[PDB]
């Protein structure tokens, strides 16, 4: 995407980090359910603005990372595909707007940015500026000018929905004794038994008054089984 015109991808229910042929990777992790994603081609200098807690025209007027997001970003030099003679003026971005962006805000209206009192009436002039810019990135580009391709990921960390990454597994099951457990949205250790009751199914799990987990809709049938902490006590 042209970053001012960024494009979502929404993905669930399936890592290339099992290689590192790609060059660049900003991250907060190293499996989980499902994700929102975006991607862009960017000149190597401007990537500075692409972090939580960042400045400048990108954070102003093209994109906004939430300063409290969670997610990861991978980038690599895309000169090889992209940094071609003369052209590449397709790859647009917004230089001005009436206001700064909120997280994942977007704007592709292209009215002339008036500035000050000027009733610029849709025509460019002094103090009457057209809102956008584009790289026109080319083979002579120094690396700060050269395009990197970049992909952006952020995590739908709610755990009742069923989804997963590509690389994951699961075992058989048993009804008793202490065991070490996992689910794509739940993991730990516990001494399981049956349940006296069943949930509203929208709830993935029952929880104690202490907020510890109590039961979960086990995907073997979304089934409901009720668990003591594994038998422990003073001596």
């Amino acid at each position, epitope marked *: 995407a042209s970053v001012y015109a960024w494009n979502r991808k929404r993905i669930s229910n399936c890592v290339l980090y099992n290689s590192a042929s790609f060059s660049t990777f900003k991250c907060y992790g190293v499996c989980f359910t499902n994700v929102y994603a975006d991607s862009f081609v960017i000149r190597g200098d401007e990537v500075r603005q692409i972090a939580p807690g960042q400045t400048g025209k990108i954070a102003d007027y093209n994109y906004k990372l939430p300063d409290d997001f969670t997610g990861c970003v991978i980038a690599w030099n895309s000169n090889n595909l992209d940094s071609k003679v003369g052209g590449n003026y397709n790859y647009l971005y917004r230089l001005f707007r009436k206001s700064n962006l909120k997280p994942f805000e977007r704007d592709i209206s292209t009215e002339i940015y008036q500035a000050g009192s000027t009733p610029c009436n849709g025509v460019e002039g002094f103090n009457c*500026y*057209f809102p956008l810019q584009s790289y026109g990135f080319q083979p002579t580009n120094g690396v700060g000018y050269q395009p990197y391709r970049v992909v952006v990921l952020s995590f739908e960390l709610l755990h009742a929905p069923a989804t997963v990454c590509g690389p994951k597994k699961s075992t058989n099951l048993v009804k008793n004794k202490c065991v070490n457990f996992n689910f794509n949205g739940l993991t730990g250790t516990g001494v399981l038994t049956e349940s006296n009751k069943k949930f509203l199914p929208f709830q993935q799990f029952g929880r104690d008054i202490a907020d510890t987990t109590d039961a979960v809709r086990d995907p073997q049938t979304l089934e409901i089984l009720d668990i003591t902490p594994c038998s422990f006590g003073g001596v």
Partner: antibody, heavy 126, light 110 residues
Framework: VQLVQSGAEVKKPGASVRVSCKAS????????MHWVRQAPGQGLEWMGW????????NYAQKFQGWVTMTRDTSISTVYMELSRLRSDDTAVYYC??????????????????????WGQGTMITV | SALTQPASVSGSPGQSITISCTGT?????????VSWYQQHPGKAPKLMIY???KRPSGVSNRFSGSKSGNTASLTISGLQAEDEADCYC??????????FGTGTKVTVLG
């Protein structure tokens, strides 16, 4: 720096005529581009501009309703059509690329970087 | 446009004949954006001033652009026989328009 345009697209009077101009070396899109005309011993007109990085324009309202600018990014090219003219509309007509603002780069890479090559809207005979 | 300036303003070298490119407080005095040009006829022209007096890069030699109010007021900063030539003027104008002058022939004296 490069700039070129079409020459004497001659007619017989009353009619429409097309033009193309071309500029490069300069990052052709970098700012809005202007049309200009003069004739021998006459003054020089400006008639409007096109923005490469949009479709936006200005005109001199003398000319709107019978002049017809347009621009390209597939081949870094720009174009004009002068249409159904008055009899003996005849001169030489041109392209140029100045204006109000830096738009980065050479922060005043401006008008006479491109105030350039010529062509002759005309009628003639063998 | 009716914006105007004389013809064949002339002199012997070094005498620095001066060009009252003149218009209106809606154009020349309207705007901080006035512009000036010269040439040997038939060539593409030669700009010397783009705003009041600020010369482009390379434009320095024997140039003295200026404005006050509704007059752009360029001094050619002394003639130097430089001129099988003619001289011209322009500005940016209201509604982001642009304007041009009559221009002015030059001649050189002994």
């Amino acid at each position: 720096v490069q700039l070129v345009q079409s020459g004497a697209e001659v007619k017989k009077p009353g009619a429409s005529v097309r033009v193309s101009c071309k500029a490069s070396g300069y990052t052709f899109t970098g700012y809005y581009m202007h049309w200009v005309r003069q004739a021998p011993g006459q003054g020089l007109e400006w008639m409007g501009w096109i923005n490469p990085i949009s479709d936006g324009t200005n005109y001199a309202q003398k000319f709107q309703g019978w002049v017809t600018m347009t621009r390209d990014t597939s081949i870094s090219t720009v174009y004009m059509e002068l249409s159904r003219l008055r009899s003996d509309d005849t001169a030489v007509y041109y392209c140029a690329r100045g204006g109000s603002r830096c738009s980065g780069g050479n922060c005043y890479g401006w008008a006479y970087d491109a105030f350039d090559i010529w062509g002759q809207g005309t009628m003639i005979t063998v | 446009s009716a914006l105007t300036q004389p013809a064949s303003v002339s002199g012997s070298p070094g005498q620095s004949i001066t060009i009252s490119c003149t218009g209106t407080s809606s154009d020349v005095g309207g705007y901080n954006f006035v512009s000036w040009y010269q040439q040997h006829p038939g060539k593409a022209p030669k700009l010397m001033i783009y705003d009041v007096s600020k010369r482009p890069s390379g434009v320095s030699n024997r140039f003295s652009g200026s404005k006050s109010g509704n007059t752009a007021s360029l001094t050619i900063s002394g003639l130097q026989a430089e001129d099988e030539a003619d001289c011209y003027c322009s500005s940016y104008t209201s509604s982001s328009t642009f304007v041009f002058g009559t221009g002015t022939k030059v001649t050189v004296l002994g």
